[PDB]
Predict the structure of Putative purine nucleoside phosphorylase.
Amino acid sequence: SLLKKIYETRDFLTAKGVQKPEFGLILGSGLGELAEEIENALVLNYADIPNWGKLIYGELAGRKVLALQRFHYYEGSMELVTFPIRIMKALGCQGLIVTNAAGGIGFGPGTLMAISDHINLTGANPLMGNLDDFGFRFPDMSNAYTADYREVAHQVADKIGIKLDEGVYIGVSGPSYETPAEIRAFKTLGADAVGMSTVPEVIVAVHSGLKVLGISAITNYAAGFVAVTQQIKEDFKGLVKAILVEL
């Protein structure tokens, strides 16, 4: 069963040394280097973990984090994508900082975009269809991207001088990139950035009762539209640590 699997893995993790994580941290494509700065790190490889590419537990800005350096729906299962989020909850995390590499639609290269909301165009919902024992059939998604966290994110960014934009992320399955016409359609539907992750993790986070901060790093426009990537990367690492201090 799902819950039985959730326990086996939480116990293996706890015995390995995963004590009391406060935030889950999912590092997107190109954003993995911050895991190297986790102190007193416990490094466990994905293949080594039961029912489950590295897992890192340790200290970052002095916060205990369980960092993922991720599964995607396009690799083949919403269950494997979101199982890590269930584990974060089961180990006692209070929130999720989920990040990704996104194609720009409302924003160009260099943008760090904190996620205000999302659109699920993956064709799948990770809560389908067994979760009965959680007793939470119809999660409300109106504050999935915790307003309070986004407020903290902006306050920190404003203080320390890192530009932090804000907008809507549309999640699709991948793995092929979207065509120009698709991106035009997604703009019409209100999307500011697109990518192949995050939406399923966030839906599960909400069902889990987890608070969530979403951050998209935008290196490239999406289809139809020098280094920026070193700047992106430096800003990201600085902004994320500074946020963790007071999250």
Summary: The CA atoms of residues 89 and 112 lie 27 Å apart. The chain has one domain: 1-247.
